[PDB]
Design a protein around this ligand. Sequence first.
Ligand SMILES: CS(=O)(=O)NCc1nc2cnc3[nH]ccc3c2n1[C@@H]1C[C@H]2CC[C@@H]1C2
Length: 287
Amino acid sequence: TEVDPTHFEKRFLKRIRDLGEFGKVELCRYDPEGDNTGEQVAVKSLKPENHIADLKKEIEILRNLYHENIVKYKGICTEDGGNGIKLIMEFLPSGSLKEYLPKNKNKINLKQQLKYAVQICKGMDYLGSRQYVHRDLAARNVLVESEHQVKIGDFGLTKAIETDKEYYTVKDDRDSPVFWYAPECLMQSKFYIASDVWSFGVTLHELLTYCDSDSSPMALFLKMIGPTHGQMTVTRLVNTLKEGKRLPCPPNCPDEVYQLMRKCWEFQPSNRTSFQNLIEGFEALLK
Ligand SMILES: CS(=O)(=O)NCc1nc2cnc3[nH]ccc3c2n1[C@@H]1C[C@H]2CC[C@@H]1C2
């Protein structure tokens, strides 16, 4: 009778709090000894409110990503009856950039922010080179490993780009993070690697504003276009982008950093900078 270190029994999984939420992520303590000494893990499960194939594809994607800036897969939790699966990941106590940055503003300077930018680009470049589109790159999905290290922590919308194709055609777009989305995603429901570059520029803007809610891309775009357009919000967002309007320069952000951000926001995907170029650009500012 052999031992699988990637197999977690649901009986020993004890919920502590919600980390995020068709899917939900919870902080759990895996306690097979039942004495509260067990390890804390992040557990992704389906909400009953079936998307089992989607979660299984996410698990298979994450199980085969090995990068310092990508959250670690720990294992799976399956029930003997064959009904359902849970994704088990490592837990990062500092949380995402959304929680970490407002709390550590005095500790985190521009140099450390640019190092996080490089790490996000590296994790994203590794993902892209493996023919994947992330589709949900935002600061809330960037986890803090330590003051010196960040990791992409959620892959719920990650899709494989088919061979001999430049993009993924989006069908389900109801819960799209529209304020992080490139015009081709909003207008044609097409997802390219360059669309993840656009989303990175938006995430870079959040990082430079220390994830303050009043300076969020949603709060800023709604001030630009109007906050009471309801079902017309996306069209008014697309027109604004078609006009060449973009998010403004963060306070105390030097122009050279802002210019790299603007290269992520070129209207045409082909005219946008790559993650390789972004990495080179930030590295040139760090030395
Ligand atoms: C509100 S909070 O809970 O303060 N911080 C959020 C958080 N913190 C996380 C810590 N470790 C994690 N391991 C895997 C995910 C994960 C964490 N998450 C979330 C679950 C996934 C969707 C948003 C991120 C990633």
